[PDB]
């Protein structure tokens, strides 16, 4: 039985592991959707009612997401950091009024300052096009940045021709190895002496992947790639998803402790969702965003679910009910 760093208790329960050497969209989607829970490079059948830590899975859709103040704050932080640069070093630690006037004359003055003037906007001559308003716009325009009259910068999201013969993959192997071993050591010591050829191969290179055969006349790229970040002379690579043309599922990846205060890991999910929206808007039917795993006894799950509203489903149902109905019973 694995460790439960939580409420102290004697917990007995196992999600029996398994794995089949046959990759298909139906097989994997069923093995992740019907009822399942896994932690590792394996598919585990969960039989879990013995614990002190509730668990649940949540899936959302992109139809209801809009930016908030926190999203604006993180976006501004990232933009300003990337643009203006920063090299910090942290350390530990006269006329008078009348009573009747005050009320009535001032209220009427406000009313007759609002009313007597020509001030009105008039215009009457799928729909995510819009530019006519004195209103802030969405995040789509801000996904791509603008640079001043200088040449020192780099922003790009380049596709990966996935085939294990390249120099970049070899360097990325060592970079990810060092990053994740350091992260593991920092968060909680874990014996790193197991790092061998087979161990690292199964840790990073191995993954359930298959090719996509398009039955159309395509002018586009099919997304099974990696996402990179741009920094000083050492490039990062953090992104893992394989997309047959019905699938949206991304697996978590590790970060250096610096990312705790300089990165945008949470915003990475929003960026990838925006990329999927951009690649799907052209001609396709896709409303898929499935990533949920929570051990929730805290006020964090409300922030996590802020991505809601979204449709819910338990494994006895045939009607798509909005999360509002399920909000109280389980969430509260």
């Amino acid at each position: 039985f694995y460790r439960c760093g939580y409420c102290k208790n004697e917990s007995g329960s196992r999600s029996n592991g398994m794995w089949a050497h046959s990759m298909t969209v139906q097989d994997y989607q069923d093995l992740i959707d019907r009822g399942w829970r896994r932690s590792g490079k394996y598919v585990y059948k969960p039989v879990m009612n013995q614990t002190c830590c509730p668990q649940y899975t949540i899936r959302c859709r992109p139809l209801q997401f809009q930016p908030s103040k926190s999203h604006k704050k993180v976006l501004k932080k990232m933009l300003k950091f990337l643009a203006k640069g920063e090299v910090p070093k942290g350390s530990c630690e006269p006329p008078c009024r009348k009573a009747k006037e005050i009320r009535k004359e001032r209220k009427r003055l406000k009313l007759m300052q609002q009313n007597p003037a020509g001030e009105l906007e008039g215009f009457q001559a799928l729909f995510p096009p819009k530019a006519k308003s004195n209103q802030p716009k969405s995040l789509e325009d801000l996904i791509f940045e603008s640079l001043p009259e200088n040449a020192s910068h780099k922003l790009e999201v380049r596709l990966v021709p996935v085939s294990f013969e390249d120099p970049e993959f070899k360097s990325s192997f060592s970079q990810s190895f060092s990053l994740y071993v350091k992260y593991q050591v920092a968060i909680h010591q874990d014996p790193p002496d197991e790092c061998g050829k087979t161990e690292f191969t199964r840790f990073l290179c191995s993954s359930p992947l298959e090719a996509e055969t398009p039955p159309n006349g395509p002018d586009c790229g099919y997304g099974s790639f990696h996402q990179q970040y741009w920094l000083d002379g050492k490039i990062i690579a953090v992104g893992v998803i394989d997309i047959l043309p019905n699938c949206v599922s991304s697996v978590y990846l590790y970060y250096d402790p610096d990312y705790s205060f300089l990165s945008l890991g949470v915003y990475s999910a929003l960026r990838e969702i925006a990329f999927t929206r951009q690649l799907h808007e052209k001609t396709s039917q896709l409303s898929y965003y499935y990533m949920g795993f929570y051990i929730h006894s805290c006020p964090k799950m409300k922030y996590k679910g802020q991505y809601r509203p979204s449709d819910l489903l338990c494994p006895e149902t045939y009607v798509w009910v909005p999360i509002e109905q399920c909000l109280p019973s389980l969430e509260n």
Partner: peptide, 12 residues
Amino acid sequence: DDIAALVVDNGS
């Protein structure tokens, strides 16, 4: 997410 099994585990 929050889980202690993921951080400490003899598997990959």
